[PDB]
Amino acid sequence: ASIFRCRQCGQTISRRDWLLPMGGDHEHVVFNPAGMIFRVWCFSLAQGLRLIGAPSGEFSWFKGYDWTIALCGQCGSHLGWHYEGGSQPQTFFGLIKDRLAEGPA
Amino acid sequence: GASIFRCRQCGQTISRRDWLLPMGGDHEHVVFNPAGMIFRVWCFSLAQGLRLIGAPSGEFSWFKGYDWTIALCGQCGSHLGWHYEGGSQPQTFFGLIKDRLAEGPA
Amino acid sequence: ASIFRCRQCGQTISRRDWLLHEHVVFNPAGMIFRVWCFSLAQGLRLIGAPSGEFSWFKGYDWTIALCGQCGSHLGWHYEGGSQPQTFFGLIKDRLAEGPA
Ligand SMILES: Nc1ccc(C(=O)N[C@H]2CCC(=O)NC2=O)c(O)c1
Ligand SMILES: Nc1ccc(C(=O)N[C@H]2CCC(=O)NC2=O)c(O)c1
Ligand SMILES: Nc1ccc(C(=O)N[C@H]2CCC(=O)NC2=O)c(O)c1
Ligand SMILES: [Zn+2]
Ligand SMILES: [Zn+2]
Ligand SMILES: [Zn+2]
């Protein structure tokens, strides 16, 4: 019964029902090669994003997946990444919890 | 990809996914202390970059036959978990609080 | 590790004094669970009708036991057997352990 919206503009992005426990947990704290730290929640599906660039396997936080940057398709806020090319699931999203706002449908 | 664990507060090198240790079946144990704080602890055979403070205590030990010392990040002082000693097979290991770490490339 | 609580929300469920300790069992899909059996428990909500399907414990039917505080599935209540008539089989990995 709860949806996650872009914190910057309010667009609906994903749903609590779509939380996915990748490696056992839906929440992963991660750091990128530039040493930036993010708190990522995994969701099976999303809507309202815009994925940019071609998929890349380098430094993927999730083994067996390629990633693309995900922006809010409405306002352009960087909300996380889409992952593809694996199995069970084939694809999923890692969204930056602090850039979403959770709320009632 | 996601092979090294760092302190989430400051980036200090702490451990590695390769060093995770399944104690009693699982590397993950969820526990609470006398103050009712719940922790999701990951067991590691090895860790670095910590500062172990105090002398070991067996009081309230979550792990049978081990005494604990508090493990802080050696750089920033954040409480990252506990070192366990005095036990058997293994004698020693680390229990680190998963959400106080950040996972990332080597 | 004398009190057992819901790992998701902390609701008190049972205690080492009530234990009967791990049983390793597989569901029909061959997934591993570590079950602890307790003679007593509290703070659950038992839902639905008893079922004998794939019961791990010969002689007993099960009902689903949820955490009464947050609704997380913590295990099952077993009934209809003998010595004892009833008990709770809770999933070790869904519980948090700590002091009294
Ligand atoms: N110079 C940079 C800056 C940033 C990144 C960056 O954020 N990468 C992410 C992409 C998603 C992922 O799973 N893992 C990462 O490490 C990167 O790969 C190179
Ligand atoms: N007043 C307090 C507050 C907290 C603790 C505390 O976190 N103890 C931990 C230490 C590690 C352990 O295995 N078990 C615990 O229960 C404590 O022992 C006393
Ligand atoms: N979609 C399902 C259906 C059933 C189970 C499952 O764990 N069944 C248990 C019920 C208790 C028991 O004694 N034996 C079992 O095999 C499950 O894990 C998923
Ligand atoms: Zn937006
Ligand atoms: Zn630190
Ligand atoms: Zn609960």
Topology record:
The structure is a homotrimer.
Chain A: E1 2-6, E2 12-15, E3 27-31, E4 37-43, E5 49-56, E6 66-72, E7 78-84, E8 92-96, E9 100-104
Antiparallel strand pairs in A: 1-2, 1-9, 3-4, 4-8, 5-6, 6-7, 7-8
The complex binds ligand W1B (3 copies) and zinc ion (3 copies).
Describe the structure.
Three copies of one chain form a homotrimer. With 105 residues, the first copy, chain A, is mainly β. The first copy, chain A, has one domain (2-104): Peptide methionine sulfoxide reductase (Metal Binding Protein, Guanine Nucleotide Exchange Factor, Chain A, Beta Complex). Helix content of chain A is 0%, strand content 50%. Chain A has strands at 2-6, 12-15, 27-31, 37-43, 49-56, 66-72, 78-84, 92-96, 100-104. In chain A, strands 3-4-8-7-6-5 form a six-stranded antiparallel sheet, with no helix packed on it. A three-stranded antiparallel sheet of chain A has the order 2-1-9, with no helix packed on it. Chain A is globular and about 35 Å long. The interface between A and B is medium-sized, with 16 and 13 residues. The site of one ligand W1B has 9 residues of chain B, from loops.
Q: Please give the oligomerization state of what you see.
A: homotrimer
CATH architectural label of chain A:
Beta Complex
Largest interface: A-B, 16 and 13 residues
CATH class of chain A: Mainly Beta
**Residue share in helix of chain A:** under 10%
Give a count of the beta strands of chain A, DSSP E runs of length 2 or more.
9
> Which ligands, by name, code or SMILES, are bound?
the ligand Nc1ccc(C(=O)N[C@H]2CCC(=O)NC2=O)c(O)c1, zinc ion
Helix run count of chain A: 0
Strand content of chain A: over 45%
Biggest sheet details of chain A: 6 strands, antiparallel
* CATH level-3 fold name of chain A: Metal Binding Protein, Guanine Nucleotide Exchange Factor, Chain A
- Give the SSE string of chain A: EEEEEEEEE
Distance between the termini of chain A: 6 Å
As a whole number of angstroms, the C-alpha radius of gyration of chain A is 13 Å
Structural class of the helix and strand makeup of chain A?
A: mainly beta
What's the arrangement of strands in the largest beta sheet of chain A? 3-4-8-7-6-5
The CATH superfamily of chain A appears as Peptide methionine sulfoxide reductase
Domain unit count of chain A: 1
Name the overall outline of chain A: globular
